[model samples]
Structure formats: structure tokens, C-alpha cells
Target: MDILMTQTPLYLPVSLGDQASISCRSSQTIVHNNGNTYLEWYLQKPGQSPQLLIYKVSNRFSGVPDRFSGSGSGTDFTLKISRVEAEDLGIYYCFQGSHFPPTFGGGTKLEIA
Candidate 1:
């Protein structure tokens, strides 16, 4: 099934060490035969490659800070940043690897307002 994004991030001003949460809702269940959602989160900065932040629902990619986390299942999902830092400013994305032609959510631009 083609996963459609149901939620997108709203523009907002955030500060360092502040709690930030981004929702990534989908139109279809992302759970696979293993009974786990094959969801991932990535951050892409201007002029930089996208960095994998979370995978398999909540597992942080290697070198990803503990402050970054993911949660939720089925069609609803979320990625949370315990404390926002300067480096966290970028475009955030949610991806579903459960289906062929894996899909991604509309990128959320994090601006330093």
C-alpha cells in the first residue's frame, strides 16, 4: 500500500534546550510481518546530505544523539527532540520502508526564528 502523509509540521520558532515534537501521520499501517513499524526519520541540512536519525520506530541511528527519539505506530507517528540545538535546524522527514517504492513525508523545515 502506498503510505500517504496525514500530518505535516507547522512553522514555529524554537530555542536551544527546548522540547520539540513533530508529528508524521500516515494513510496506511506501516507495521510489517515482524510486528514492527518500519518507520525512519531523517534530517537534511542545506547543502548537506540527509542524516538518518531514527529507524524501526525508535532506534537511533549510529552517532545520533540520545536527545532525538521516535514513537507511535500504525498510521500515526511522531518524532521528538528532547532538546533542540543549533545543529538540529534542518528539514525533517519521515519515511516508511515497509512497502516497495518506500514513501516519505513532506519535509518539515526547521528555521531559527
Candidate 2:
């Protein structure tokens, strides 16, 4: 899975309890013929490795907050934060696990404004 391209330095800011969103545009369609997407979402702090937020589109990883969710399929996907929190400030990545090589989005960051 190779990323054909990506947009860098994407940024967003939101206050506590405010809705926020981040998007990833893929060069290839992520939807498999089975109607499942290869997309996954990750959160990476300054020093930690990216943590899986959502896999296969909308499934939450263990202990993940209910507010963090995912939507979309194919070439465009969005990660929605229903309500922002201070702890959510960090870099977000869109990953395509469906492809063998595995591609990733350039990355988007969120901050409290």
C-alpha cells in the first residue's frame, strides 16, 4: 500500500465539548469488493507510536473514548471527534491496512483553541 500523495500540515482546533473533524484523501479506493474499507485511524503523541483509534472504518480499539469515531469509504474518509478534550491534542493519521504495503496520510494535528 503506497500513498500516491498527501497534504501536509493540516490543522484544526476546537474547545472542550466541541465537535472536530480531520480528513484523509487517498489516491486509491479503499473499499474492497466485500464492502469493507481498509481504512484505519491512529493518534500519535509527540513521543509515542501511533495508537489505533478506529479500524476497518468505525470499530473502536479497547479503551478508546466513545467520542472518537470514523466514517467514509473508498478514496475519502473522515475521523470525527464528537467532543474535543485536552488529551486529544496530538497528531492524527489515516492508515490503509487493507493494502499489503500499508500507506499512511501525511498527518493532521488538533489543538485546543
Q: How many residue pairs clash in each candidate?
A: 0, 1
49-110: candidate 1 lDDT, tens digit per residue: 99999999899999999999999967888899988999899889889988776898888888
Model 1: lowest-lDDT 10 consecutive positions: 4-13
Best by TM-score: 1
lDDT to native, each model: 0.84, 0.81
Cα deviation in Å at residue 85, candidate 2?
A: 0.5
TM-scores of all predicted structures? 0.91, 0.86
Question: What's model 1's overall lDDT?
Answer: 0.84
> Model 2, 1-113: lDDT tens per residue?
46642534488766888998887888877666677777888999777888999999888989999999888756778888888888898899888866557888878888788
